[PDB]
Design a protein around this ligand. Structure first.
Ligand SMILES: CC(=O)SCCNC(=O)CCNC(=O)[C@H](O)C(C)(C)COP(=O)(O)OP(=O)(O)OC[C@H]1O[C@@H](n2cnc3c(N)ncnc32)[C@H](O)[C@@H]1OP(=O)(O)O
Ligand SMILES: CC(=O)SCCNC(=O)CCNC(=O)[C@H](O)C(C)(C)COP(=O)(O)OP(=O)(O)OC[C@H]1O[C@@H](n2cnc3c(N)ncnc32)[C@H](O)[C@@H]1OP(=O)(O)O
Ligand SMILES: CC1=C(CCOP(=O)(O)OP(=O)(O)O)S/C(=C(/O)CCC(=O)O)N1Cc1cnc(C)nc1N
Ligand SMILES: CC1=C(CCOP(=O)(O)OP(=O)(O)O)S/C(=C(/O)CCC(=O)O)N1Cc1cnc(C)nc1N
Ligand SMILES: [Mg+2]
Ligand SMILES: [Mg+2]
Lengths: 847, 839
């Protein structure tokens, strides 16, 4: 009513457009879903005086045209002001040369799809038709990154316009893409079992069209499993940033390697790994200084409408949890798409935070190029039939503006189409090779000859002394202090436990110049209070990392090594994905991921199945990620007992991974040191102990570290070092893990000279030669038994019971099993029932 | 202008006031007032006092992210108004809950100091808060509250909220279990569930309270709870598939702060909240935010301000409440239920508290968090502070409070003594649960020809003016023809099985990614009008008898979200919630079921042995080597076979449509409340040889072992057979076509349709019909380390030594991936198998 009362209604209106203007924005290319006298009156705006008509025009233009902005949810006021200053101001129109360049990208995007439709009508390619604006948008992201002088852009994306992105953004040769469609692959392309064309990656150098800077562009490989690559990309980028000494663990806060993550609208809302990966964005051990997210929102998921794909307004609403700004942009406006892309990069650079671009578009054809979409979405495809497409609509705009002519536009398309045909002809002209079955990739990585993993006594002692080389005035917790003192004593006197042997292995590698990354749930202290990789000051809370002292030589010079130890988030899928990604990103790093209990690794099953166990065969992607899985039957229940050995053994083929269950601390030390020094970029699966960590018998001597190597097959010390007679042995018990000690204690108690226990430390690849050689030392053996704690359908028996009598018939024909009955669950819920079952196994083994 | 600054200030408190609220009980991180303004006309001092009281005291309110204006106004009206204090009787009742909560934890600390119980100490306010949720649900006249929660205060919740007898809880600590408690392999005490009846203290209403079982896997039970509640809602005819939109079954989901932010299944389950096939009319979420995750600080557990920030994606209101204020906690709990009832939407309560002891009762927390535990040691505890507050108010005396605690402590000791007095039973190893569910004798699954014809006729019984898509119409017409003339394909036999069950009165729930039409355009369970977009479900016509009476059955078919973990979890929960329902979940390709590994491992394969929880969930997994790549080839048969033990599940790979029909009808009629794993076909859906006759549906039953038709119906001689090829799946047709082409009378192909439990007797009986067999081979498309060979190669020579000693394998080499990436390489490998099998 009054001038003071009207001014309050203006501030409400300013806020309404800033908070809810995006709900009115003309973002959908398909289009499916105070008095008038006060307009010329001046009002106070945060302070300057502006007319209502000018305030309203700025608000409508910024928030209700082809760009929908979601940013008021952000808690940082400086971020809200930064977005406000760049969206609520008239941004200069692009140059004729820049416009022509955008059209050239839309031309290369559309013609690439139509060419494939004409030549390979029967083959699926997951076309970007109806979403061609992704190409000039990604180009603008990469160009803006190059303008900031960044080092690399790493891309992860699904199937949608993948071939297009590889050819028009990354720079993968058209000849290579057409050869995959032709089915005529050379020995390098036909190597391994392989994977489909829209899962493959590439690398290249992006050169600025209107700038002088250049930037590396990489696209990583991925399975069909939508969004599974999300933490893998993050891990890959983090490893690269750590090598470049940029980012969280670097000197320069540049975060010069940029993750560019693409997504589909149904997969972004539906896959849990998306929230798991976004939750890593600002963590100390996982941050990459912000990811640029592009959602190719074609408002469909195969035959599923968005109404059945999510419970939220936008497919991007999950990204609001990390305070990420969200930009919904109309896919029919390539200039707004290129502008939002450059704004996104600028925001990422200013606040080192994630930015999400929701590109509203459509899918011109069916889900695949063979699917009929009118069966399930007739109304949408009746609307698509009327739409002209971004390329033709943008061409008509540029001719209308007077930038180009109809002839210039037509000659440009014919030049690109001509170039494709010329390359297609040469691929067809290549002589067709004989199609042969896929071959095992086992021989691709050769075991090095005579590799030494032993360390000198001085090394053990230095790692020991490092545990007591505390900073001035540091107050050690009274229950942590005996561990540090016992470790220095262990390093000089012997009887080294499992927890110290692990740190002796990692510390000696750091001293040799290796980067060690160790992470997992409560991994800094350890689930079983054994590691103490990081010790906390009882009074101040200051952290001390003893192994970090080994990154410096005694003269003061750096070794080149580093110890990166973190407590992970309560995730398995994202954390395992990230560590796999890290190991691929930096192959010279020692990357270890620890499960709280091995029973939780099934939460990251997609990473194990789709990346860790099959990545080499499928894409030639090498990873040496170490998985530490606490395993053992101790009466703690079915979810605190098994790391599912049987599952990893089942997945094993073509010498893809090393699967071990060491029984001694020294053997574990040699296993870890071999993995970090052998140069075999293949994963390592370690079934680690819980109660065995504190077993007084499960200790090792200094000579085991300084004079021995890894031993895949272990005999009882009485036959190798003692006065035991191998000829008295009639019964042979073959085992793996902590049950050896329980069997050895029973053998000692009853003085059973007729029984020998042989341990298999390396489960896969099977040490066939060493195992045969070891059994040949017991000539009077009449019966052999595989003994294990695990149920009959679990542990090593499902694979060993079948492979051992086949690979060694003269040694294992008639091999019987001693174990728990076949069980649905990994063990019993009661510790008392476990104890009875355990005694039954020992009684049977000595019956 | 002054009035404009007031509007910005009003907005500042409503949007960001929660950042200033005194919600943390530990406190770790550190002239115009009399003028009137237009809001009605109110003084700035009165506006400011209302804003500070509503948004900056012990309750932090996040709601301005909500897009519905009516929801924002509803919260504003209940939050920005002076709320009446609870009555002396209500206050005394809240203290009685805090007394029960703390004394239960101190009693277990004193009696079983060495056993881990995951104490709720420092978070005792969860008990009066949950009581207020349940009491408010009972006040709304709701039928049931189903709870899912982790380990934190689980024993406490079972004893003080659900009503699990203390005698039972203490017998679990003593390790003295009777035959019913010791049945199966079992699970730890803080994973078990219970049921009971909640009776209002100051009301006359009663409500069912249930707590569901769960594994250690934090948050995995979230979609399971949703599915369980949804099945109960559908039975009560309340909700989305009901006459009334009451949603009378309430999901009460509890969480830990580190698990809520870190587990992806949380976002997957929240994404289901408003979907047609998954919505439960809103979940009440309680986060026990003790600002710790074992030894991990919140700074390393999440990238967001609040552990609850993920729930803002479905526009859920979030209430951060101080755990030291039990009255604010009880008020927020009742506000949450009221919001859920008004808008049938999810509500999140973030109870800020602390963990008095270590992660477990044996863990020393000062090793990793010395500052936090130096602060906790100075804190008095919600029970003692609340006791002192009521003494100060004059509600109770020091004597009345002490006498109340003595009564609860005295009752606990009395019960503990009786459990100790019980005779200790001999501890024996766990036993298989196989015999618990017996196969029924002579169960008929065949239907009359008229039923096949009715399901056929239903595909063409289109509504008036309905326009069928030109490529969908031949499927409907071919189906009516198939129903009367025979040559029934796979896709129609499935709908014949489901349709006949609906006609018999069974509730059929079928869901999965693009399941309504089918990934391979074969199902067409829902047909869309080409002109209007109107949907028509042919099988729904079978829920009505020809006289017009309902059969009692219903067809619930949905397109799922792009999830595996939550969708499989939900369907498992649904099958447990309604055991009389036919619940089927279909994977796009079986290669994506590993995204639900935790549900398969922790619920489907081991739920019966661990908790006595029975599920008859059906997993449909499209499987087969066709050259579509390593992620469009295998459902990982070897993994399901590995998990199989104690007759927990049925694992099948049928080769004929008729067999699949009988497998599905047997599952829905046999009464065995155990899951079914079906490896379903892709190209075999359109194979002209993979068809069945009417007689196989009307006069036959499921056949676990199948012979070639030439021996059972044709003119083939079994005695001429010298080589025997044992197989499963679509490769049979490729082997049969090779046998026919080369006229190999010396070779016979025997199919194993049911992989687990192994049909040992039928398999032996079938092989005894080929007496001149000199060599036997297991033939499969799958790599040597995959398919049925890893288990069959070991079990078959052991269970049947006179038949399978020296059984050799014919398959693809052992592979890291389920198959090759090239279709050309697949074709060469496939021909190599056929060539070896007939070499
Ligand atoms: C990660 C992988 O799986 S790549 C494995 C390579 N595979 C092949 O070469 C195919 C043939 N395979 C084989 O011969 C066996 O499975 C092998 C590799 C275990 C060797 O059999 P064995 O000789 O009986 O076991 P053994 O422990 O004595 O191996 C002997 C040597 O190979 C090394 N070695 C064995 N397995 C591995 C492994 N998984 N990673 C690294 N080095 C290994 C040992 O350290 C040892 O080196 P050394 O002779 O200087 O002491
Ligand atoms: C889901 C489960 O695992 S409950 C399994 C019960 N387990 C046991 O009884 C342990 C002993 N096991 C066995 O006898 C075998 O493993 C069985 C159950 C497969 C039967 O072996 P066979 O007789 O050789 O195969 P067959 O298919 O002819 O089974 C015969 C009968 O049992 C029924 N049957 C077999 N398996 C199942 C099953 N998984 N679910 C329901 N019914 C079944 C058959 O339909 C048939 O019924 P019918 O007598 O009316 O014709
Ligand atoms: C469900 C599914 C698809 C629906 C796609 O939904 P969107 O995310 O909206 O993507 P588009 O619209 O297709 O660009 S594609 C798809 C494919 O097989 C990808 C083609 C490939 O790469 O081989 N799957 C199957 C699928 C289901 N579940 C999971 C976890 N991953 C999947 N890939
Ligand atoms: C990581 C982990 C825990 C940390 C708990 O974090 P929060 O969510 O904040 O809970 P609390 O503070 O303990 O109430 S408890 C826990 C337990 O073993 C639960 C005790 C049990 O039920 O046996 N695990 C291990 C764990 C790791 N990953 C997954 C998916 N689930 C887990 N349970
Ligand atoms: Mg889509
Ligand atoms: Mg916690």
């Amino acid at each position: 009513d009054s001038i003071e009362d009207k001014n309050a209604r203006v501030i409400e209106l300013i806020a309404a457009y800033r908070n809810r203007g995006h709900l009115m924005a003309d973002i959908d290319p398909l289009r499916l879903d105070l008095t008038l006298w006060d307009l010329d009156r001046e009002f106070k705006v945060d302070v300057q005086r502006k007319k209502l008509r000018d305030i309203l025009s700025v608000l409508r233009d910024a928030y209700c045209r082809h760009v929908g902005v979601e940013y008021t949810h952000i808690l940082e006021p400086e971020q809200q002001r930064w977005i406000q200053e760049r969206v609520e101001t008239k941004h200069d129109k692009p140059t004729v040369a820049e416009q022509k360049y955008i059209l050239s990208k839309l031309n290369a995007a559309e013609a690439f799809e139509t060419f494939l439709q004409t030549k390979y009508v029967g083959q699926k390619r997951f076309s970007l038709e109806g979403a061609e604006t992704v190409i000039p948008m990604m180009d603008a992201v990469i160009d803006q990154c190059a303008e900031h002088g960044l080092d690399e852009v790493v891309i992860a994306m699904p199937h949608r316009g993948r071939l297009n992105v590889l050819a028009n953004i990354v720079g993968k040769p058209y000849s290579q893409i057409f050869s995959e469609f032709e089915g005529n692959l050379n020995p390098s392309q036909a190597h391994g079992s392989g994977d489909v064309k829209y899962h493959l990656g590439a690398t290249g150098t992006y050169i600025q069209m209107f700038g002088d800077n250049d930037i590396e562009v990489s696209l990583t490989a991925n399975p069909s499993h939508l969004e599974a690559v999300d933490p893998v990309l993050e891990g890959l980028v983090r490893a690269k940033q750590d090598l470049l000494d940029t980012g969280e663990e670097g000197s320069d806060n540049r975060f010069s390697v940029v993750p560019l993550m693409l997504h589909g609208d149904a997969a972004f809302a539906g896959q849990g790994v998306v929230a798991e990966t976004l939750n890593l964005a600002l963590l100390r051990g996982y941050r990459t200084g912000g990811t640029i997210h592009i959602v190719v929102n074609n408002q469909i998921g195969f035959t599923t409408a968005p109404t059945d794909s999510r419970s939220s307004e936008y497919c991007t609403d999950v990204a609001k949890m990390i305070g990420a700004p969200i930009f919904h942009v109309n896919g029919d406006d390539p200039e707004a798409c290129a502008w939002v892309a450059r704004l996104a990069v600028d925001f990422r650079q200013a606040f080192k935070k994630d930015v999400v671009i929701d590109m509203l578009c459509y899918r011109r054809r069916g889900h695949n190029e063979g699917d009929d979409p009118s069966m399930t979405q007739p109304y949408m495809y009746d609307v698509i039939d009327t739409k002209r497409g971004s390329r033709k609509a943008y061409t008509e705009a540029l001719i209308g503006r007077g930038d180009i002519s109809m002839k210039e536009a037509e000659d440009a398309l014919r030049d690109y189409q001509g170039q494709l045909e010329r390359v297609f002809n040469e691929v067809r002209e290549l002589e067709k090779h004989e199609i042969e079955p896929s071959e095992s990739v086992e021989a691709d990585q050769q075991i090095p000859s005579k590799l030494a993993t032993a360390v000198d006594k001085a090394m053990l002692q230095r790692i020991g002394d490092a545990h007591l080389a505390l900073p001035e005035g540091f107050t050690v917790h009274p229950r942590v202090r005996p561990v540090l003192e016992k470790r220095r004593e262990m390093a000089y006197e012997g009887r080294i436990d499992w927890a110290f042997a692990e740190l002796l292995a990692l510390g000696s590698l750091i001293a040799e110049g290796k980067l060690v990354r160790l992470s997992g749930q409560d991994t800094q202290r350890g689930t079983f209070t054994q590691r103490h990789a990081v010790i906390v000051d009882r009074k101040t809370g200051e952290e001390f990392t003893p192994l970090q002292l080994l990154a410096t030589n005694p003269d003061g010079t750096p070794t080149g090594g580093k110890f990166l130890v973190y407590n992970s988030a309560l995730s398995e899928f994202a954390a395992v994905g990230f560590e796999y990604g890290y190991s691929v990103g930096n192959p010279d790093a020692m990357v270890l991921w620890e499960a709280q209990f091995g029973d939780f690794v099934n939460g990251a099953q997609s990473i194990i199945d789709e990346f860790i166990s099959s990545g080499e065969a499928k894409w030639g992607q090498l990873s040496d990620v170490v998985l530490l899985l606490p395993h053992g039957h101790e009466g703690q229940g079915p979810d605190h007992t098994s790391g599912r050995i049987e599952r990893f053994l089942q997945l094993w083929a073509e010498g893809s991974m090393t699967i071990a269950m060491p029984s001694t601390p020294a053997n574990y030390f040699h296993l870890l040191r071999r993995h970090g020094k052998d140069g075999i970029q293949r994963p390592l699966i370690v079934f680690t102990p819980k109660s065995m960590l504190r077993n007084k018998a499960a200790v090792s001597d200094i000579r085991d570290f300084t004079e021995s190597k890894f031993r895949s097959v272990l005999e009882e010390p009485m036959y190798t070092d003692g006065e035991g007679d191998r000829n008295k042995v009639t019964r042979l018990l073959l085992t793996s893990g902590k049950i050896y000690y329980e069997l050895a204690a029973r053998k000692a108690k009853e003085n059973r000279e007729d029984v020998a226990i042989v341990r298999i430390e390396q489960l896969a690849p099977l040490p066939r030669r060493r195992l045969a050689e070891t059994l040949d030392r017991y000539p009077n053996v009449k019966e052999k038994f595989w003994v294990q704690e695990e149920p009959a359908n679990q542990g090593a028996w499902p694979s060993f019971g079948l492979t051992l009598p086949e690979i060694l018939p003269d040694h294992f024909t008639g091999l019987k099993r001693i174990s728990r009955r076949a069980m649905s669950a990994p063990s019993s819920g009661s510790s008392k029932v476990h104890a009875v079952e355990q005694q039954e196994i020992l009684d049977t083994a000595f019956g």
